Amino acid sequence: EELLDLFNRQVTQEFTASQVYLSASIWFDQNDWEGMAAYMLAESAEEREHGLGFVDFANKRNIPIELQAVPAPVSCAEWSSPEDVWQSILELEQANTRSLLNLAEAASTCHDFAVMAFLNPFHLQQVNEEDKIGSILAKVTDENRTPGLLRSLDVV
Amino acid sequence: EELLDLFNRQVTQEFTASQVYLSASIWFDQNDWEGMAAYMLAESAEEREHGLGFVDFANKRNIPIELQAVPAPVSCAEWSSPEDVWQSILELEQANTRSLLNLAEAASTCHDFAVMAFLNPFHLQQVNEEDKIGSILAKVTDENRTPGLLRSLDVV
Amino acid sequence: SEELLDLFNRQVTQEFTASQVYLSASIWFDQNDWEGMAAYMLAESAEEREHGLGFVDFANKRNIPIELQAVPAPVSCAEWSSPEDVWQSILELEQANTRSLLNLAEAASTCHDFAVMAFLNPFHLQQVNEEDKIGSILAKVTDENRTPGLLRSLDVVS
Amino acid sequence: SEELLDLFNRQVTQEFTASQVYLSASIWFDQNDWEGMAAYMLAESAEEREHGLGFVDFANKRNIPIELQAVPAPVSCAEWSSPEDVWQSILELEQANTRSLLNLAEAASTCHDFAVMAFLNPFHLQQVNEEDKIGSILAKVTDENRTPGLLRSLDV
Amino acid sequence: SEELLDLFNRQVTQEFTASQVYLSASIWFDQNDWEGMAAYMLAESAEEREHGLGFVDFANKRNIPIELQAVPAPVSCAEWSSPEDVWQSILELEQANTRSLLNLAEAASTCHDFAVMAFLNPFHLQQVNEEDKIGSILAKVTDENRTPGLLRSLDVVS
Amino acid sequence: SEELLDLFNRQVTQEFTASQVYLSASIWFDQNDWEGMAAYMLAESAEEREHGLGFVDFANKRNIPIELQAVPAPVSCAEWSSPEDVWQSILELEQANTRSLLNLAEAASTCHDFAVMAFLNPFHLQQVNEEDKIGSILAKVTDENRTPGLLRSLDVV
Ligand SMILES: [Fe+3]
Ligand SMILES: [Fe+3]
Ligand SMILES: [Fe+3]
Ligand SMILES: [Fe+3]
Ligand SMILES: [Fe+3]
Ligand SMILES: [Fe+3]
């Protein structure tokens, strides 16, 4: 069952993204970027809510779920500026999107209309999310060209 | 036209489900399961609302509807206990799901994007409906293992 | 007696039949862009179903076993060509709902079933009002339809 | 593909085109003292422009490059002689808008562009409603205009 | 007289043309992540359209025939490389807007068309305010863009 | 505070591990139509995650470097076959949560780390409440399950 495997992989991906957001929050806080840290923290909670949403749907639809390990976040070992963090987060969101499109493709092949329906708001949410991050990343890489200026904008 | 047939049959299945629910409420009332009876009666009204929503849509989309007979319910002749009723209601909801998927499959083939959009909330509702019925039947089957205990579910 | 039981079941069937026929009238009206008349018939469809459900509840309480019968496909829509045809069939439908109720009352009266007769009284009075109201809409329709477009101009209104 | 970006641009144009066509109908109605019908077309003109703006916003978010095309002048108003002529042109405009959205949907479908398909669903459902409503208005106009002066009653 | 009637008809095209150019500026700003400037341009796009609708409504009342013309494709977007280029084009747009209203008022004046001159007064005062507002934004923009990153930091603000 | 830093990290791991085990319990309950027990475990999963975040936040303020470890795949769920088995595994999870807090407090006490010890105090007390509550639900579960169907009637509660 490709569809079942992909659905389980989607849950893991949501919780993986939740932990990576959490890792970003930690790096920001340790480096005194409290406004960015709070943003990443809120995003960590929202990603977990997505995973929980997929778990609930799967239970109702009899798609057997088994929780996999949530891997330790790795990018954080090499972040050295807010630009590096935001870039990893963009890449994370790009991967979340492909991971949802993969799942949709599998559902489409199986003619699974209920799964396709369930995924629609997540596809639209990902469009908004990639846009929002790509646009914070533009602003960060523009303001970091003047020493200190980026800080002055972490002022939430 | 296959799409136009499958759309009419859908209206028929919603109204037929409405009557089957009403037959189940009657069987429970006659047998003093007033709680289960009120539940079935609410579901009857709700299936009827789905049929009317299909009819309204078909009217707007110029999908000619012609109302078919609602057949005499017949499972009621055979029900001996709440478990038999709830088992039939599960198979009814499984037939409602099947009927929706048949119609979606045909809308897909025809690239009828509007019909497919219209069906999405019904797909997601059926997921919840089957889960809910499956779960009630689980409880009934467990509680009916001790004499008189199921009579406690009915007071809820 | 089984005669009473029979007529009580028939009454439930007639209410649900009327509910379906009212629904077919809504559909014809809607398809032909008479949204006001369509809304009226849709409300009546829901009300007739409510009456059937009231009879079922009463029967269950009184130990009158109900067995639900088929509700036939409404077939008059095949031949309706104007609002007047539709309202004419609805007036005939209400004349039939009045008949099945007076059949039932006749049998209850024979049987000295005071409880059934008491239960039927508000339904007799409601049919009086229903027949009056449908007869009166039909007279308005039939008058207004003598001038092209005039009927439409009032669906919109009313 | 390329055809998908293209058709997405084309959609924005079709929305703004239809906005102008509605404004031209308002003008003919006003000029000929049908103020109620004029109010109605004017509100629809605003709404079509809002639809184009919604497509522009989504395209921006999804990095579909939009480039605004000229908005063609409306052509039908030179030949309108009566309200029925106007409402018939507006029915055709809406049928044109529906075909336009289905074209776009067909392209997204081939591309497996699930985000674009989710985004279009409320528009497919809205167009069903719009065509029904204009159809219904046209029916009434065509019936009432059979008696001299009677249509002026509708205008309210 | 025909001079005036044509210039009035054509003011409607100029309002909608300005609407579409504002919209094009909004798009450029959104695609380049200046959401704050994009929202300002989008609001002005709606307001320019409302002005053209105001002209159309007045012409209908005064029996000035309106024939709606093509709204030209905006063309400065292809050339814009920075917010300063966009605000500069928007300034030229408003100065054109102002000149087209002054030409209209001049024709009305020649025609002794007191109604048209009255109708135009609040637009002349509005153009004064808009040109000032855009001149001012363009001055801020050109000053802040002297330090890398600084202009960003104010889109975010205002 | 080498020992102390590593124990403080492990505590974060244990909170998030417990969060996932609660979630796995919620899933087993939902799949087996025990909605009320499932709700309870979901509620607990959220609250374990919150504890994890409180430890992380304190660590960040106190400059204890946190590196987030893998959260392992829950395993007990492969063996559960009745509610009693789930609640017994949850009681053992809470006993292990109490144990890791107590390793932490011992290391802090050794280091005379007064702020860390102050920070743990409400968690100590919470763990008392939590072990008591889970012990008490397990006792009720084990009792009601002696009559067929009886437990079900009280998830319905
Ligand atoms: Fe997500
Ligand atoms: Fe249904
Ligand atoms: Fe009745
Ligand atoms: Fe539109
Ligand atoms: Fe203007
Ligand atoms: Fe804990």
mmCIF file of C-alpha atoms in Angstrom, chain A residues 134-135 138-139 142-143 145-146 149 153, chain E residues 33-35 147-150 152-153 156:
data_model
loop_
_atom_site.group_PDB
_atom_site.id
_atom_site.type_symbol
_atom_site.label_atom_id
_atom_site.label_comp_id
_atom_site.label_asym_id
_atom_site.label_seq_id
_atom_site.Cartn_x
_atom_site.Cartn_y
_atom_site.Cartn_z
ATOM 1 C CA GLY A 134 10.389 33.192 1.091
ATOM 2 C CA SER A 135 9.277 36.770 1.827
ATOM 3 C CA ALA A 138 14.102 38.237 1.287
ATOM 4 C CA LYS A 139 13.689 40.875 4.002
ATOM 5 C CA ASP A 142 18.249 42.557 2.412
ATOM 6 C CA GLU A 143 18.448 44.066 6.018
ATOM 7 C CA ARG A 145 23.540 44.005 4.456
ATOM 8 C CA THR A 146 23.827 46.754 7.091
ATOM 9 C CA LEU A 149 19.806 46.608 11.065
ATOM 10 C CA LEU A 153 13.677 44.493 13.030
ATOM 11 C CA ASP E 33 8.256 40.988 -1.173
ATOM 12 C CA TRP E 34 7.359 44.611 -0.439
ATOM 13 C CA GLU E 35 3.949 43.648 0.977
ATOM 14 C CA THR E 147 21.642 52.529 2.984
ATOM 15 C CA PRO E 148 21.354 48.811 2.124
ATOM 16 C CA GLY E 149 18.398 47.156 3.795
ATOM 17 C CA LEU E 150 17.005 50.334 5.317
ATOM 18 C CA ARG E 152 12.890 47.235 3.854
ATOM 19 C CA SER E 153 12.817 48.107 7.414
ATOM 20 C CA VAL E 156 7.490 46.550 7.355
#
